[PDB]
């Protein structure tokens, strides 16, 4: 699973 939106890296 992911952990957030790409703009949160």
């Amino acid at each position: 699973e992911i952990i957030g939106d790409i703009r949160q890296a």
């Epitope: 699973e1 992911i2 939106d5 790409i6 703009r7 949160q8 890296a9």
Partner: antibody, heavy 130, light 111 residues
Framework: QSLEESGGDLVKPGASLTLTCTAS?????????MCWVRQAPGKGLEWIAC????????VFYATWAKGRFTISKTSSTTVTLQMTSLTAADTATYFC???????????????????????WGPGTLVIVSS | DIVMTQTPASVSAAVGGTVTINCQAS??????LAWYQQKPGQPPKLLIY???TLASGVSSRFKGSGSGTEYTLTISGVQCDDAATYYC????????????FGGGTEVVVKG
């Protein structure tokens, strides 16, 4: 694989309302976001909120939405949108939509991007009027 | 906040001709751009995603192109069944944005 919104209704200004999207022929998994997109009569599409089909709690709101609307998973086949402090500007058809994403990686964790909607309900009508 | 601007707001095309719709993004979106067609009383139908990938079961008369900040939708062999409203939709981010859809373009088919 389909969707059916419900809960739409005629309500007074200031009222709250909860809409429900019910999935069939599939169930929410870490592959999708489940989303609400609305559209006021004669106007454009307006994105509202997404919630992660996966197990982790991840929610995104449009900036006009956060604080007034709440998206949630109430089961693996149902997502709700709670609306509060409704005004006539909230009169719209409300669509439930499944959202695709690619999980790109960055240094240490994966992130979602490349969002598009591949599945929509026919909508439920919310009408706010005195 | 990534603001999708579509132009023109409306456009005409004679039957058999070609129509182009434009989408502009306030910032680069890495070709994460989707195009939908909506007919009255219906939910939108996905046409194109990843800027240029034609969705399954959609007419190849629909072409998505462009990159960076400027995208395009080109309908070739325009037909009456095409009269609809078209939307572009940036798929780069759902964090910190107002709307992912552009304002949409009305396509009128001159028969």
């Amino acid at each position: 694989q389909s969707l059916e919104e419900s809960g739409g209704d005629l309500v007074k200004p200031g009222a709250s309302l909860t809409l429900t999207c019910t999935a069939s022929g599939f169930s929410f998994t870490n592959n999708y976001y489940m989303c609400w997109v609305r559209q006021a009569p004669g106007k454009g599409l307006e994105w509202i909120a997404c919630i992660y089909g996966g197990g982790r709690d991840i929610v995104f709101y449009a900036t006009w939405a956060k604080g007034r609307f709440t998206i949630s998973k109430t089961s693996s086949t149902t997502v709700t949108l709670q609306m509060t402090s409704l005004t006539a500007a909230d009169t719209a058809t409300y669509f439930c939509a499944r959202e695709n994403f690619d999980a790109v990686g960055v240094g240490g964790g994966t992130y979602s991007t490349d969002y598009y909607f591949d599945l929509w309900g026919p909508g439920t009508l919310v009408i706010v009027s005195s | 906040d990534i603001v999708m601007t579509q132009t023109p707001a409306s456009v005409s095309a004679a039957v058999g001709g070609t129509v182009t719709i434009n989408c502009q993004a306030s910032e680069t979106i890495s070709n994460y751009l989707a195009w939908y067609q909506q007919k009255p009383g219906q939910p939108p139908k996905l046409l194109i995603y990843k800027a240029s990938t034609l969705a399954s079961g959609v007419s190849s008369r629909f072409k998505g192109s462009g990159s960076g900040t400027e995208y395009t939708l080109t309908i070739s062999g325009v037909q009456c069944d095409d009269a609809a409203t078209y939307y572009c939709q940036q798929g780069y981010s759902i964090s910190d944005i107002d709307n992912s859809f552009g304002g949409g373009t009305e396509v009128v088919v001159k028969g």
